């Protein structure tokens, strides 16, 4: 379970890193869409994050 959480945030991080390339120079629209996708992965991280602490 610990390993699976890292991968989900990594994909979210990639979109966060990748979203860190559009908002600059005036392309706000693209950045909004990228963050919208990350919310789906964030939800998995939150659910998995709490479970790992509970299992400890």
């Amino acid at each position: 379970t610990e390993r699976q959480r890292d991968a989900q945030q990594l994909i979210a991080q990639r979109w966060y890193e990748k979203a860190q390339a559009a908002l600059d120079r005036g392309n706000e629209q693209l950045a909004r869409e990228a963050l919208g996708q990350r919310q789906s992965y964030q939800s998995h991280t939150e659910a998995l994050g709490k479970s790992l602490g509970e299992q400890r």
């Binding site: 860190q20 908002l23 706000e28 963050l35």
Partner: protein, 49 residues
Amino acid sequence: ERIETKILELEAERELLNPPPSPLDKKFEQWEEQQAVEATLAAMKARRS
């Protein structure tokens, strides 16, 4: 046409065993996404500014 009847009969059970979300939650889950996107973008537009 009778095939659609069997399709509907099974699909009719779909909403039963797993009731769909209430309109309140539908009104709310979408409602709260407008803030997470903006709030998450709030730190973005202020950080990259």
